[PDB]
Amino acid sequence: NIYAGGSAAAAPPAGFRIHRPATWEESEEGALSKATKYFLLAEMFRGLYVVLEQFFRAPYTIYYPFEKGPVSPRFRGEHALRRYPSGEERCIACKLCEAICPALAITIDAEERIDGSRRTTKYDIDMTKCIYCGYCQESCPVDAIVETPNVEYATETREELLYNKEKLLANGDKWELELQYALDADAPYR
Amino acid sequence: DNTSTQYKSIIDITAVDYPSRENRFEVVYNFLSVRHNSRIRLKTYATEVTPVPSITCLYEGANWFEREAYDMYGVFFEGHPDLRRIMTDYGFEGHPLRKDFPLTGYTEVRWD
Amino acid sequence: GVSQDLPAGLLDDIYMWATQFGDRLDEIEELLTDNRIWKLRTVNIGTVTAQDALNLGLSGPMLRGSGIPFDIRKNAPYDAYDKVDFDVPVGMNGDCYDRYLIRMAEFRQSLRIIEQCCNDMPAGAVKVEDFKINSPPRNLMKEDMEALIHHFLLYTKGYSVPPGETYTAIEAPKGEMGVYVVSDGSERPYKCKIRAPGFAHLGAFDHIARGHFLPDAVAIIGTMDLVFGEVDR
Amino acid sequence: PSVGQDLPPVGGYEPVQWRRNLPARGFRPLVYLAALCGICGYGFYRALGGIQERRELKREK
Amino acid sequence: LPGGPVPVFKKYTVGSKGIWEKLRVLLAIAPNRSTGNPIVPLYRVPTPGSRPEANVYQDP
Amino acid sequence: RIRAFTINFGPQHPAAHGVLRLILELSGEEIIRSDPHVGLLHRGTEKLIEYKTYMQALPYFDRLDYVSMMTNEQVFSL
Amino acid sequence: MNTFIIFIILIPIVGFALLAVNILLAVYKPYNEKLGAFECGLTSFNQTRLAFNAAFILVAILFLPFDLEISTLLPYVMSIYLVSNYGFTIVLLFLLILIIGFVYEINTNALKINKHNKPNTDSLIYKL
Amino acid sequence: AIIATAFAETVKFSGSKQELQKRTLALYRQFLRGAPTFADLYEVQFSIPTIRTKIRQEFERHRFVDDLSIQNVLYAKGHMEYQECINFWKQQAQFLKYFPEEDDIQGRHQPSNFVDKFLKNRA
Amino acid sequence: AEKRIAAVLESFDKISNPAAITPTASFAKDLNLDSLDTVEVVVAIEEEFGIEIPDKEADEIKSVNQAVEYI
Amino acid sequence: MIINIVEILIFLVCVLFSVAYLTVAERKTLAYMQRRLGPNFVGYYGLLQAFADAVKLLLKEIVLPKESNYIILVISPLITLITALIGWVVIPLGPGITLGELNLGILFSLAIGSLGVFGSLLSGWSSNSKYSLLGSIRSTAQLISYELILTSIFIIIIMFVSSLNITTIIETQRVVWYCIPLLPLLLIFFIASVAETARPPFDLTESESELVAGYFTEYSGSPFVFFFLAEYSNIILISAFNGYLLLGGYLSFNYSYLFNILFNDYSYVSFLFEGLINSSAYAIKLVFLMFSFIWVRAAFPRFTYDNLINFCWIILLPLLFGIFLIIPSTLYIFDSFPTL
Ligand SMILES: CCCCCCCCCCCCCCCCCC(=O)OC[C@H](COP(=O)(O)OCCN)OC(=O)CCCCCCCCCCCCCCCCC
Ligand SMILES: CCCCCCCCCCCC(=O)OC[C@H](COP(=O)(O)OCC[N+](C)(C)C)OC(=O)CCCCCCCCCCC
Ligand code: SF4
Ligand code: SF4
């Protein structure tokens, strides 16, 4: 009806008060069966058996680096700068990657090339600032900056992780075929 | 404690810095009523020298929230039993969530 | 919405994982649920009363273990939780063992919801269809002038959010996760405060752990389900 | 429109198992108690017979 | 009761054949339980980089 | 007069998960007072978000409860 | 010089040889920070000895009488046939007497550490 | 409940400057008394008198502040710092922030006049 | 005994007359010791004798004579 | 002399290498119970893993903390290892086939065993940390508590035999292994042996304590090797106690008929074959008990200190006193007191 300080949904549901706990004298199991369970550790033995069953199942381990875990076309690994089939660079220095970069990991410099083209004179990625989010690759209007599926590029010195333009272009040249597999698989979804 | 409100859970306390106002800081309280399935927000104001009454007497959960509000903004809470920094480094100078505190602060560390 | 659509063979693979996850849960329960040592470590350990749970700011299992049936997915439904069928487990003793049982039941309810989503996944777009908010697809971006302009602007300036404020909360796996965001009408939030359930749980630690033994403290930390990036943001 | 999207089967998937599946196994507890009694009693029979025969060997020595 | 136990041959996990299947059924705590190893010809095949649907996908 | 014994449970401790400094006070066996010191992982995320666009701020939410990334994203998105 | 004595001499020799090899081959570069006690990476203040519970004392003290009780049965098990029925009665009486002490220990709850802090169970009463 | 820690004082803004002066001199006494505990906790090279001198210099810095609210805040923060130091919550690294002079000479060239500052582009 | 107190309070700065320490000399009136200086000398006394002195009694001390009367 | 030296070298090599390979076996067995592989890379099939760990540790710097009694901290693990290995001198792999054939062999086992608490007791004193002292105190209390249980079971067994010679105790089980009439004592002895070696689920000191990793937290280099070796050596030795007290030691089955078919007279071939059969029986029992230690580690969570002290003093010890009463009563009822 009319509620004061309440409502139908704040009324307790049917059966919300719990039943009274049962005492020892209202137990179905006799004391000898309970003592058998108590002294012979029945549920502990069930647990041991469950563990032992696993011992005869196939393990999950793979033998890295001779085998490899699953990788997908969208995976975000080490960066590369790509070319056109002619060999001309795709990057035209729009600086959209630099603007979007959540970690401010990209530093770009550009001017007019002696042939009149709009091109970068400096393209740096601080890989120790990068968060590997893929936003640069989404932002690029010409598919110039990409993330490869490569994760195996650990270094012994930090200076080796400051990628300049030569390093990134060489990465593009090195990984172009894998990049093409990934693009052929995921371009329709972008 | 009113029967039609019954906001028993304290959700959060924070501050917002408005440097144009004479009172810089607005203190925001959010409350939940599980009884009525309802939320409510309450605002007040403060400056760098005028405190606010602590609500720890009413909600124990408020304790840490007021500490964070003191650590980030410098708002004091009168009646808070144990009010000290909770986030920043020991001996940290400044309240980093003020609009005039620079993003990277004033000091950095290294091994000497 | 989401940044990309699902790839072609994903629903089938999620379904095949779902057909065996139930057994995976049963074997963990075989090791734990009835183990008398597990009960010695969890029963009547880290007890919280319902009134104190509310007063301390606890949420999620930390609250449902004390007997209070509250869950944002049922109380204030968001994205598609109103369209799926699931149950909410509620404790009565407010201890670590009740909270363990709650989490184990929540495993099963999540499996239920995942199966319903695998069966009812509809067709259409996955992000809002306004290019002033989300970027247009790339074949439009490289063919259509408006699409290119909107893409350029979204990735350099960002969209503008109407001025105002909100506190928005969801039933995150560790309890109620909220954000209080203040917009000044620009492309950058004026203020953003994160309400982490672990913050309030760790705040309640001193009230809950008093009078316990040190291993009980280890168990209580484990029952609060703490991740510290949440705690100190 | 929608071409090439991941979608569910027309009839749907067969239901998965999500409810607790921990069936009770084993004889009733008193069966294990009876087996323990029988094992121990037979062992005591053998051990006491062995002790008695050892005592007769001691007599001979 | 929906959600109840389903037999092991309706779960996409490898399992056992022949005499070993009889042995496993005799020795399992719960015979309807799967082992957890995905069936290699069926699972994540074809690989996500060689889906035919990619060449027909259009923006929805 | 009861004299508490004070232990630093953590940060470099398996149960303390590397970053919690739980200062406990024990009278023999029992905890009498507990003082969790935090901020060993305070990164200033909330300060950083104010200098980001909303789109640029989204990935910070992945890194809050870093086993529950997508629900963190979901709350910010909602 | 049987195998027993030679083996007993040989074990400590091998331990000392392994120790000597470690001393000879490992580097040794002590310095102040390395020499600190490891307590989770921090430093704690030196403290007066912790106050301990009485059960800690009681387990160790009560070990000795129970250990002596158990070890006093060695002469019985080594003489059981010789003393057969008379000594069987005597050893039963001895065991029963010691069991009375076990009963005292059990009923006094002597080895239980009681959690000093307990939930408050008082009713809430209002004077209207 | 959530109980306060060692040497915690609830925040109270004194309504009068004399009632604050009492609390302030008490805090100064506490610092001077804790100086030897500080020298033991933080394994310092310098002497106990150096610590007490530093404490005096700290309290001296605010000797002429007039506004009551500002003095209240200075007192509450000074008490926070006392609680931080006496509980060993600080490590040595942050404690030694207070003693920049105790470190050795940083170099031969600390300019004082205009020409020396101008030769280092600091004029 | 009082000579130890005179020795403690003699070795302090800001006072140019070491012989001005008469058994009933007030720090704020004769020595011209500051409020902070008074706290310092009280702490030095209580440290020299190894005794702790409570807040009210410490603040009420204002002179050498009261120091001995409490010593 | 020469034969003595050869026999001691053979026995010592077998024991030390068995201890080395028990650690590898634990890692592999835990791994396969956890659906992984374990060491399969250091050596073929991971068979050199233990030796890699040993060489690594032997080349690792020893640290002596500042507040530390350095002598006590370097000798405590040494004495625990020395007593642990000395325990092996009385274990027989066939009738009289032992390094020490002592008429007081059981007493030797118990005495050397009771020297096993001093490592935990002295390790905490090694430093000047109150965390360390409390942890060492608890571990010592657990150790002596379950020492009582083990000693009681020893005495209960000797009630059937009336001998302290280990070979004789094994020899009387040719009629029945003592685990058959006293199966609950098999369960109790295994539980107490796990507790006495401070193995999971009885590993308070190392895994829930103030110091991160027990009272060995401060140990590096060869002292750490000593503690680790002593622990695994005690696992195998306490399992050997279990084997000869309750599992019939080196007894498997009556091979008289088979030997009479195979051989027509005594030779070194028949002697070698009988020795192999006896030793293989004892070895396979030891293997099952080691596997059980690892299996129990795989299956269960830990006790607390209060739980385990209660388990020893309120549940197990009263049962053992009741058994003290009932065993001589059964021997009296049926007139079966054992002769000497
Ligand atoms: C029916 C008539 C019986 C007549 C008398 C019985 C004769 C003796 C029977 C032999 C076995 C007795 C020894 C085991 C008794 C265990 C009893 C027990 O449950 O202890 C419980 C104890 C907590 O005490 P409590 O208060 O009583 O429990 C109430 C909890 N709400 O907490 C505990 O201690 C938990 C139990 C300890 C388990 C230890 C586990 C360590 C390793 C497990 C060994 C399993 C076998 C390993 C071998 C591998 C398998 C091949
Ligand atoms: C409180 C205990 C009450 C138990 C009563 C059971 C009596 C049943 C009748 C069978 C006896 C029999 O007939 O077998 C006789 C046996 C073996 O002697 P034997 O060489 O074969 O006889 C020939 C007599 N000579 C030698 C003079 C020629 O003697 C026994 O000791 C076996 C008794 C069965 C074991 C009972 C132990 C109970 C468990 C105790 C756990 C504390
Ligand atoms: S992946 Fe993200 S963080 Fe890294 S460079 Fe690209 S946009 Fe910047
Ligand atoms: S990589 Fe792409 S987004 Fe970045 S500057 Fe070059 S063209 Fe523009």
Domain ranges of chain G: 3-28+32-108
Amino acid at F32: I
Q: What is d(CA J150, CA J161) in angstroms, rounded to the nearest whole number?
A: 17
Q: Strands A118-126 and A162-163: what pairing?
A: antiparallel
Residue F63's beta-bridge partner residues? none
Tokens describing residue H61: 């810095």
Contact H56 I36 (CB under 8 A): yes
What are the backbone angles phi and psi of residue A162, rounded to the nearest 5°? -95, 95
> What's the gap in Å between J187 CA and the centre of ligand 1?
9
Taking CA G14 as the corner, what is the angle to CA G10 and CA G19, rounded to the nearest 5 degrees?
A: 150
Q: Return the DSSP state at C81.
A: G
Own/partner long-range contacts of H52-56 (Cβ < 8 Å, ≥24 apart): H52/I40, H54/H98, H54/H99, H55/H28, H55/H31, H56/I36, H56/I40
I71 Cβ contact list (under 8 Å, min separation 6): I1, I2, I5, I45, I49
Tokens describing residue C180: 């209080």
Max Cα distance, chain C (Å): 70
Q: Is the Cα dihedral J156, J159, J160, J162 positive or negative?
A: positive
Residue matched to tokens 């990735």? C155
Q: What is d(CA C181, CA C63) in angstroms, rounded to the nearest whole number?
A: 25
Tokens describing residue C144: 């259509």
What are the backbone angles phi and psi of residue E30, rounded to the nearest 5°? -135, 100
Contact C52 B60 (CB under 8 A): yes
Q: What is d(CA J269, CA J258) in angstroms, rounded to the nearest whole number?
A: 14
Residue B33's beta-bridge partner residues? B38
What are the backbone angles phi and psi of residue G67, rounded to the nearest 5°? -60, -45
D34 Cβ contact list (under 8 Å, min separation 6): none
- For residue J217, the distance in angstroms to the closest alpha carbon of chain A comes to 30
User: In angstroms, what CA-CA distances link J184 with A39, A68, G2?
Assistant: 9, 50, 39
Contact G115 C210 (CB under 8 A): no
Q: What is d(CA B36, CA G9) in angstroms, rounded to the nearest whole number?
A: 81
Residue matched to tokens 């971006």? C141
Contact C125 E44 (CB under 8 A): no
For ligand 1, pick from J146, J194, J311 the residue to mutate: most ligand atoms within 8 Å of CB.
J311
Q: Give percent helix, percent strand, percent coil of chain G, each to the nearest 5.
A: 55, 0, 45
All residues of chain A having their beta carbon less than 8 Å from the beta carbon of residue E14 are: 58
Type and span of the H or E element at B31: strand B25-33
User: In angstroms, what CA-CA distances link J22 with F25, J46, J278, J298?
Assistant: 41, 13, 21, 15
Among B2, B4, B7, B103, the strongest candidate for a mutation testing the A interface, having the largest count of A CBs within 10 A, is B4
Minimal-distance CA residue of chain C relative to F65:
C230
Tokens describing residue H2: 């959530």
- DSSP three-state, residue H118: helix
Specify whether the CB–CB gap between A82 and A144 falls below 8 A.
yes
In terms of DSSP H, where are the helices of chain A? 31-40, 42-54, 96-100, 135-139, 165-186
Specify whether the CB–CB gap between J282 and J225 falls below 8 A.
no
Q: What is d(CA J160, CA J169) in angstroms, rounded to the nearest whole number?
A: 9
CB of J225 shorter than 6 A to ligand 1? no
Fold (CATH) for G3-28+32-108: Methane Monooxygenase Hydroxylase; Chain G, domain 1 (1.20.58)
Q: What is d(CA B51, CA B67) in angstroms, rounded to the nearest whole number?
A: 13
Specify whether the CB–CB gap between A81 and A171 falls below 8 A.
yes
Specify whether the CB–CB gap between G32 and J33 falls below 8 A.
no
Tokens describing residue G115: 């959690």
Tokens describing residue J188: 């109790």
Other C-beta atoms lying within 10 Å of the C-beta of residue A140: 20
Residue F11: cis peptide before it, omega within 30 degrees of 0: yes
> What's the gap in Å between J334 CA and the centre of ligand 2?
6
Contact A48 J35 (CB under 8 A): no
B74 Cβ contact list (under 8 Å, min separation 6): B48, B95, B98
Q: Return the DSSP state at F3.
A: -
A125: closest CA among A104, A152, A95?
A104
Q: Return the DSSP state at J94.
A: S
Amino acid at G20: A
Specify whether the CB–CB gap between A179 and A75 falls below 8 A.
no
Q: What is d(CA C197, CA C205) in angstroms, rounded to the nearest whole number?
A: 13
Max Cα distance, chain H (Å): 64
Identify the residue whose C-alpha is closest to ligand 2 atom 34.
D45
Q: What is d(CA G71, CA G78) in angstroms, rounded to the nearest whole number?
A: 12
Q: Do chains H and A touch (3 or more CB pairs under 8 A)?
A: no
Residue matched to tokens 């290119």? C148
Q: What is d(CA J174, CA G3) in angstroms, rounded to the nearest whole number?
A: 28
- For residue F29, the distance in angstroms to the closest alpha carbon of chain B comes to 26
Tokens describing residue G42: 């921090």
E30 Cβ contact list (under 8 Å, min separation 6): C23, C26, D21, D22, D23
Other C-beta atoms lying within 10 Å of the C-beta of residue J192: 26
Per the entry, the structure determination technique was cryo-EM
All residues of chain J having their beta carbon less than 8 Å from the beta carbon of residue D47 are: 160, 175-176, 178, 180-181
What are the backbone angles phi and psi of residue A128, rounded to the nearest 5°? -85, -5
Touching check for A99 and chain C: CB below 8 Å? yes
J14 Cβ contact list (under 8 Å, min separation 6): none
Identify the residue whose C-alpha is closest to ligand 2 atom 16.
D45
Give CA torsion, residues A64, A65, A71, A73, to 10 deg. 180
Q: What is d(CA J90, CA J97) in angstroms, rounded to the nearest whole number?
A: 9
- DSSP three-state, residue B1: coil
Nearest atom within ligand 3 for CA of residue A137: 6
Specify whether the CB–CB gap between G44 and F6 falls below 8 A.
yes
DSSP G61-89: HHHHHHHHHHHTTHHHHTSTTTTHHHHHH
Q: Which residues of J26-62 are buried (b: 16+ CB within 10 A; e: fewer)?
A: bbbbbbbbebebbbeeeeeebebbbeebbeebbebeb
Minimal-distance CA residue of chain H relative to G119:
H1
Contact A186 E54 (CB under 8 A): yes
Ligand nearest to the CA of J335: 2
Specify whether the CB–CB gap between C192 and F46 falls below 8 A.
yes
Residue matched to tokens 């094994």? J170
Q: What is d(CA C208, CA H3) in angstroms, rounded to the nearest whole number?
A: 12
C55 Cβ contact list (under 8 Å, min separation 6): B8, B9, B10, B59, B60, B61
Phi-psi region of J225 (alpha: psi -120 to 50; beta: other; left: phi over 0): alpha
Contact B61 C176 (CB under 8 A): no
Could you confirm whether I34 is annotated as catalytic? Answer: yes
Q: Which residues of E40-50 are buried (b: 16+ CB within 10 A; e: fewer)?
A: eeeeeeeebbe
Q: Do chains B and E touch (3 or more CB pairs under 8 A)?
A: no
F20: closest CA among F1, F35, F5, F2?
F35
Sort G96 into a burial class: Cβ within 10 Å, 0-12 / 13-18 / 19+.
exposed
In terms of DSSP H, where are the helices of chain C? 10-32, 36-42, 50-56, 61-64, 72-75, 96-120, 138-141, 145-156, 197-209, 214-224, 228-232
Q: What is d(CA G20, CA J58) in angstroms, rounded to the nearest whole number?
A: 10
Specify whether the CB–CB gap between H109 and G61 falls below 8 A.
no
Residue matched to tokens 């002469």? G75
Specify whether the CB–CB gap between E45 and C16 falls below 8 A.
no
> What's the gap in Å between G85 CA and the centre of ligand 2?
18
Amino acid at A170: A
- DSSP three-state, residue D59: helix
Residue matched to tokens 């607005």? B26
What are the backbone angles phi and psi of residue A176, rounded to the nearest 5°? -55, -40
Ligand nearest to the CA of A105: 3
All residues of chain J having their beta carbon less than 8 Å from the beta carbon of residue G79 are: 162
Annotated binding site of A: 91, 94, 97, 101, 130, 133, 136, 140
- DSSP three-state, residue C6: coil
B31: closest CA among B52, B5, B53?
B5
Tokens describing residue J68: 């530390």
Tokens describing residue B60: 């124990």
Q: Compute the radius of gyration of chain I from its Cα atoms.
A: 11
Specify whether the CB–CB gap between B64 and B43 falls below 8 A.
no
What are the backbone angles phi and psi of residue F30, rounded to the nearest 5°? -100, 145
Specify whether the CB–CB gap between B42 and B55 falls below 8 A.
no
Q: What is d(CA C153, CA C135) in angstroms, rounded to the nearest whole number?
A: 9
H12: closest CA among H3, H28, H23?
H23
Q: Do chains I and G touch (3 or more CB pairs under 8 A)?
A: no
Amino acid at C87: D
The helices-and-strands tally (H runs, E runs) of chain F is 3, 3
CB of A101 shorter than 6 A to ligand 4? no
DSSP I13-65: SS-S-GGG--TT-BIIIII---HHHHHHHHHHHHHHTT----HHHHHH--BHH
> What's the gap in Å between E53 CA and the centre of ligand 3?
29
Q: Compute the radius of gyration of chain C from its Cα atoms.
A: 22
Q: What is d(CA A43, CA A49) in angstroms, rounded to the nearest whole number?
A: 10
Ligand nearest to the CA of J200: 1
Specify whether the CB–CB gap between J83 and J112 falls below 8 A.
yes
How many residues in total does chain H contain? 123
Ligand nearest to the CA of J333: 2
All residues of chain A having their beta carbon less than 8 Å from the beta carbon of residue F59 are: 102, 131, 133
Q: Give percent helix, percent strand, percent coil of chain F, each to the nearest 5.
A: 30, 25, 45
Tokens describing residue B73: 């903004």
Q: What is d(CA J205, CA A19) in angstroms, rounded to the nearest whole number?
A: 42
Q: Return the DSSP state at D16.
A: P
- DSSP three-state, residue J174: helix
Amino acid at C132: K
> What's the gap in Å between E26 CA and the centre of ligand 1?
28
J12: closest CA among C130, G12, G44?
G12
- DSSP three-state, residue D11: coil
Touching check for C112 and chain G: CB below 8 Å? no
Tokens describing residue G64: 């000795």
The helices-and-strands tally (H runs, E runs) of chain E is 1, 0
CB of A119 shorter than 6 A to ligand 4? no
> What's the gap in Å between J192 CA and the centre of ligand 1?
11
Q: What is d(CA A1, CA A7) in angstroms, rounded to the nearest whole number?
A: 9
Tokens describing residue J153: 């079971």
CB of J331 shorter than 6 A to ligand 1? no
Q: What is d(CA H6, CA H80) in angstroms, rounded to the nearest whole number?
A: 11
Minimal-distance CA residue of chain C relative to B61:
C56
- DSSP three-state, residue E52: helix
Specify whether the CB–CB gap between J82 and J234 falls below 8 A.
no
- DSSP three-state, residue A113: coil
Tokens describing residue C75: 């109380």
User: In angstroms, what CA-CA distances link H87 with E57, H43, J62, J244?
Assistant: 65, 15, 33, 57
Tokens describing residue J290: 């080691």
Identify the residue whose C-alpha is closest to ligand 2 atom 9.
D45
Q: Is the Cα dihedral J298, J299, J301, J304 positive or negative?
A: negative
All residues of chain C having their beta carbon less than 8 Å from the beta carbon of residue F12 are: none
What are the backbone angles phi and psi of residue A66, rounded to the nearest 5°? -85, -30
Specify whether the CB–CB gap between J219 and J164 falls below 8 A.
no
What are the backbone angles phi and psi of residue C175, rounded to the nearest 5°? 130, -160
Q: Strands B77-78 and B52-53: what pairing?
A: parallel
All residues of chain J having their beta carbon less than 8 Å from the beta carbon of residue F12 are: 212
**Least CB-CB distance to I36: which of H22, H26, H59?**
H59
Amino acid at G67: D
**Least CB-CB distance to E38: which of C16, C27, C139?**
C16
All residues of chain E having their beta carbon less than 8 Å from the beta carbon of residue C27 are: 33
Q: How far is CA J187 from the centre of its chain?
A: 15
Q: How far is CA D18 from the centre of its chain?
A: 26
Touching check for F56 and chain A: CB below 8 Å? yes
G9 Cβ contact list (under 8 Å, min separation 6): none
Q: What is d(CA H38, CA H43) in angstroms, rounded to the nearest whole number?
A: 8
- Chain J: which residues have CB within 8 Å of chain D? 160, 172, 175-176, 178, 180-184, 330-331, 334-340
In terms of DSSP H, where are the helices of chain F? 45-49, 54-62, 69-77
For ligand 2, pick from D44, D46, D57 the residue to mutate: most ligand atoms within 8 Å of CB.
D44
Touching check for J20 and chain G: CB below 8 Å? no
Contact C215 J304 (CB under 8 A): yes
Specify whether the CB–CB gap between A108 and A95 falls below 8 A.
yes
Other C-beta atoms lying within 10 Å of the C-beta of residue J104: 14
Other C-beta atoms lying within 10 Å of the C-beta of residue D7: 13
Q: Which residues of D22-41 are buried (b: 16+ CB within 10 A; e: fewer)?
A: eeeeeeebeebbeeeeeeee
User: In angstroms, what CA-CA distances link C154 with A123, A143, B2?
Assistant: 22, 17, 48
Nearest atom within ligand 2 for CA of residue D45: 32
How many residues in total does chain E contain? 60
Give CA torsion, residues C74, C229, F70, C195, to 10 deg. 40
Minimal-distance CA residue of chain C relative to J299:
C31
